[PDB]
Amino acid sequence: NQAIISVFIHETEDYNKIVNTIESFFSPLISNSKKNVTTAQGHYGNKIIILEYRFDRKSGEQFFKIILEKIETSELMLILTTSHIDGSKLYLRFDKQYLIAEHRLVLKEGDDVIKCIISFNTSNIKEEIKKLVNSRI
C-alpha cells in the first residue's frame, strides 16, 4: 500500500555516512523511491535534517519484504511479540548506530532512529510475519 523511511540527522552525525548506508542497504529498490531532504533549525544555528524516502505501492510490499529478508529472526520475533501499530500502519524504529556501523537492523525505542512506516489495507497483520517467523525457524 505504501512505505516510508524517515530519519532526523543532527549536526554531530555524519549525514553522508547515513545516506549512503541507507541508500545502499535498501539498494536497489530505494533507487526507485522519492527522496526528500529538509533542514529545520532554531534561532541559534541549531540545524536538524529530515531525510525521507517514499515507496509507492509497487515498491511498498517489496520494501517490507526486503526488511524481512534482512532483519535477524531475533528482532523479527521481537516485532510480532509486539504496540508498533496505529491504524493500519506499522512503525518499525531501527537503530541508527547498528545500521551504519554493522549493517544490522536492530529495533530501538524513540524517534531518534531510522523509522520505517508500512501501511497495510488489511489489519490480520500478525499472521503473516508469524508464518514467516514460523517459517524461518
Author numbering: 4 to 85, 88 to 128, 131 to 144
Task: Share the article's original sentences.
UPF0201 family proteins constitute one such uncharacterized, archaeal specific protein family. The UPF0201 family proteins occur as a single globular α/β domain with approximate dimensions of 55×35×35 Å3. The protomeric structure consists of a five-stranded, anti-parallel β-sheet, five α helices, which are located on one face of the β-sheet, and three loops connecting helices and strands. We have further documented that all members of this archaeal specific protein family share a common polypeptide chain fold, which is evolutionarily related to the RRM motif found in the ribosomal L5 proteins and many other RNA-binding proteins.
For 10077b and 10077c from S. solfataricus and S. solfataricus P2, respectively, full-length constructs bearing C-terminal His6 tags yielded crystals and structures. The crystallographic asymmetric units contain one protomer in 10077c, two in 10077b and four protomers in both 10077a and 10077d. While 10077a, 10077b and 10077d all form one type of dimer (typeI), 10077c forms altogether different dimer via crystallographic symmetry (typeII). For type II dimer in 10077c, the interface surface area is larger and equal to 982 Å2. Moreover, this part of the structure in 10077c is about 5 residues longer compared to the other three. The interactions involve a large number of residues, which include Ser9, His13, Glu14, Thr15, Glu16, Asp17, His46, Asn49, Glu55, Asp116 and Gly117 of 10077c. Despite that the type II assembly involves large number of interactions and presumably more stable than the type I, such an assembly is seen only in one among the four structures reported here.
